């Protein structure tokens, strides 16, 4: 009802902000009792945030915000399966992808369990019969390449999890000999990409779709369908390509068997679907099922510390809280996702999605208009990729709080003979000094101290008082790298949860969608039926003039591909 | 002086309340402000009429451009004189692109003679290379060229090599041959950049000025362990070259010393694409002619940023309207959206640029500024992003966007029977977001189309957020080397109207030197038994985890990966 910024419990920690910019974090970090206090662990999984402009009484003020908002209710009402996406009237329910084979979640008054392990062994099946060449193509070769037509979070979460999984010892060894291939962008240029050095004899298409008429996706797959069939013949298209979907019709109508077809829920959001057969099929064509049932197993191990943890000890509370303290208290509009790990390249584009289109709201869940901003700007590249990109921003310009993340245990060790350190222990030593960096800073009598010029000490001047968080992981296998997935989901949902917001809906991509369908029809009058450009303001009608105005290359009506 | 205490300054503060009392759904139907709105050099033309502005406030910026005095710091920069006042150097990027018979001068030595000496140095040497004339230790011809390099070594040419991949033409001059960029020192990209090639057909190019890099040279000395493993101590000066001006430490490398390519300190590594950091891998993918079209784009454009009027100066618009967003309006981000999957990897490159030129806290003279400087850079391609996290661009936090979109295909496809191109679908979004985030929707609208007052609150639409839209007639190497110094000039601009030095990067000395230390401590406690000295309570935990794992191979001996 009231709005979470109305509460006494969120002035409350207005006024402690005054107390804690009077601290800074070069004496804050010399408490042995405050560092060990804000700590957390799980299992692989031990989270460091001593660093953040905090003390205990302000995670003590904030474990009471979040009981003022209902937090731990809200959260049990996401499990037990009530439909909290209520502008959708939809149940929110992506812990049940991982959930063991006996749990009882209902929704709509059924339990969904038994129905999400029946297309788990259905991918199980398919992917044995698949990897092992019973699978075979057209003109008999067995098909090692795949190809998963999607967009959005039919994109993100896969991609994530593939880059992951790629350079993992045990993972790497199962996907020998094949290659999984995203196909995203409706730009040609992406199917030119997606192809490349492929064979359609040797290919498959997973096409990616909950209704089966995305544009972006639909356009690829049927792209890459008379691809398919210039090659290889208008029969080829039931053996070489596949779907996850639910509408059976336009998924035979499109010519792939309804039997291939692999359905996921209406309860499964975009960019929760990475462990639904959006994600799971793929993964367990190119690494085989028992590494991705590895990597739903670590999900469902964070799902339950999530759900029963008490808050002091729960990781994704702790970080949702903290992330609400920095945006909505301390002021601090965006967030840096700096993993020291190259497995983790694509970590931060999906954290992008996660987070900006779940919190990128202006409304509460119940329609009042939110009088602070919400969702917060998430950007993020690898250590020491970013690094060497913008961390010179992050220590001396705008001050981002920072998610750094390291991997005890190397997925790719390298040592030479005669060298200081290895190279793993070469990455994390960054790892371990870019955080204190952060949190001390170098004052001007430092640099005075050392004989530096007058006139330089301002420029070489570090203010410190920066926060930052750690994660430090046991290693990189399937199953962490689900528990890690499985922490951000949780948290962004605790931020949605504490600002009073519905994380999982998405009506903010509407508005664009129909304005292209209106340009994609101006398009279509002025190519095929030479119609005079109409409707548009000055600004673009001048732009639809001069991209009209280079007109095609091709015959009327032809068909070309790259 | 200080540009916050200007008058023109103070005139701009108050203007934002005039903006603020319109709507760029009312300023979009001025016929009149959207033509003046916009700019045009060759193939680029520029539309900003979605700014939150009118040719006023453009007016306004001018005369803080003249209290700023812009057109006197950049004919300093042209003219070679060390602005780089904290370092000492000039900034002269512009001298990698001039023609041979310019007149650039640093300390009074005219340095474009020594930019064509390397340039000549660079296409004989690819020439010599592409003919097969240059074999390997086995006397293969090298394929396959893998650039070891960090930072602006990395991210500048990734980005223009990634442009240039689908171009039809430059795409045909490097058919069968691979460049790939090993920069994380993470040994998982070692491991990746040297998957599934064979070193008697690979070339390796280390890009360090020092040759003292602490991450690229530990990845250089790695894949040179990669090559003596497989073809002995003696193929080094055949598989190995460097972009360096440390003659001794490249003929100690191992590396002969003639194949040793320079560049200058008054190159800025953010600044170095142009240069033999960029210039010779790409002219070994894609041969010097290629590349020449690319420098000869940036020249273009440097030309027409130093003489062009400011109303008609493309980059000096672009720098004044983000400090406008920034300063004034208070946008503290910004989106950067190309609709072209080739140019995948602009953003990261101008999150470098960007961000570490102007994410500074002190004036060039050592003022501490009383605003924030520097944006926060991010984005990725459309209509990848557009499904990512335009929720948040649209309802969430105001992220002022660049748009960027090309006419011509670079690899255009159609189906018959389809009602448009892949091309013009994908551009359908490049014209229609930027209204969309313009016009927004009304609860007035909702509640005309009989959407239930419930859903109003979650469906409305602001609008009245601002965007800019480049329009490239195509994409190839000299359109990509003219949006490359449209983005390095608007930089400039933006950090010489703040007054601070776009040009020196100070704020990434402290975590290099803790890092220094850290790399200490591992060294004395994995090959010395140690303990963990030295470091906060919160280090010293996470340090004694990290070294609890010991290396699983023996004392001081190789490992390599996969």
């Known amino acids: 009802p009231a709005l979470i910024s109305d509460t006494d419990q969120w002035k409350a920690l207005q006024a402690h902000v005054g107390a804690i910019h009077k ?50 209710e809200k959260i049990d009402k996401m499990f037990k399966g009530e439909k909290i996406n209520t502008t959708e009237n939809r149940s929110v329910l992506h812990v049940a992808l991982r959930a063991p084979r006996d749990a009882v979640i209902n929704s709509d008054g059924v339990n969904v369990v038994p129905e999400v392990w029946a297309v788990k062994d259905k991918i199980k099946q398919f992917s044995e019969t698949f ?5 075979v193509g057209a003109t008999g070769k067995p098909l090692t390449n795949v190809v998963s037509v999607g967009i959005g979070g039919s994109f993100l979460g896969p991609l994530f999890v593939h880059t992951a999984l790629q350079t993992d010892p045990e993972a790497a060894e199962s996907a020998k000999g094949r290659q999984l291939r995203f196909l995203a962008n409706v730009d040609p240029v992406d199917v030119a990409r997606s192809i490349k050095d492929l064979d359609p004899a040797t290919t498959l298409v997973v096409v990616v779709s909950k209704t089966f008429t995305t544009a972006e996706t639909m356009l690829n797959a049927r792209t890459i369908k008379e691809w398919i069939v210039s090659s290889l013949g208008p029969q080829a298209v039931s053996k070489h390509m596949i779907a996850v979907s639910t509408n059976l019709k336009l998924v035979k109508e499109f010519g792939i068997d309804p039997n291939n077809a692999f359905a996921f829920w209406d ?12 994600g799971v099929l793929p ?31 729960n990781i994704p509370v702790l970080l949702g809280l903290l992330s609400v303290w920095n945006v909505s208290f301390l002021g601090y509009p965006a967030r840096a996702i700096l993993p020291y790990s190259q497995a983790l390249e694509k970590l931060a584009p999906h954290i992008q999605q996660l987070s900006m289109e779940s919190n990128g709201k202006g409304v509460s869940i119940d329609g009042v208009r939110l009088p602070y901003e919400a969702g917060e700007i998430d ?11 913008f961390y010179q921003l992050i220590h001396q310009g705008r001050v981002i709080p920072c998610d750094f ?14 060298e200081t350190v290895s190279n793993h222990d070469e990455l994390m030593s960054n790892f371990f000094a870019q955080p204190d960096a952060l949190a001390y800073g170098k004052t001007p009598e430092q640099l005075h ?43 962004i949902a605790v931020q949605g949860f504490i600002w009073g917001i519905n994380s999982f809906d998405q009506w903010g991509v509407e508005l664009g969608k129909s304005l292209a369908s209106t340009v994609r029809k101006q398009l279509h009058a002025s190519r095929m039926e030479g119609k005079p450009v109409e409707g548009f303001n000055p600004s673009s009608a001048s732009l639809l003039t001069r991209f009209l105005a280079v007109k095609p290359s091709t015959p009327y009506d032809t068909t070309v591909l790259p």
């Open 23 to 72: 601290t800074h974090l070069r004496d804050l970090m010399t408490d042995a009792d405050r560092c060990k206090a804000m700590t957390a662990e799980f299992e692989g999984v031990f989270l460091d945030y001593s660093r953040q402009q905090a003390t205990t009484e302000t995670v003590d003020k904030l474990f009471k915000l979040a009981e003022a908002a209902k937090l731990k």
């Open 379 to 389: 950007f993020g590249e690898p250590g020491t990729n970013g690094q060497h990109s």
């Open 131 to 135: 990897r092992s060449g019973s699978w």
């Open 283 to 313: 993964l367990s064509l190119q690494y085989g099922f028992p590494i991705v049932q590895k990597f739903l197993e670590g999900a469902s191990s964070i799902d339950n510390h999530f759900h029963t943890s008490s808050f002091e000890k």
């Open 449 to 491: 101290s050392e004989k530096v010029p007058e006139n330089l000490i301002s420029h070489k001047t570090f203010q410190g008082n920066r926060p930052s968080l750690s994660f430090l992981l046991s290693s990189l296998s399937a199953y962490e790298i689900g528990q890690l997935l499985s922490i951000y989901e949780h948290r």
């Open 267 to 278: 309860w499964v959001g975009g960019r929760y679907s990475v462990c639904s057969a959006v």
């Open 405 to 418: 993340i390291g991997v005890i245990k190397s997925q790719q060790p390298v040592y030479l003979k005669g």
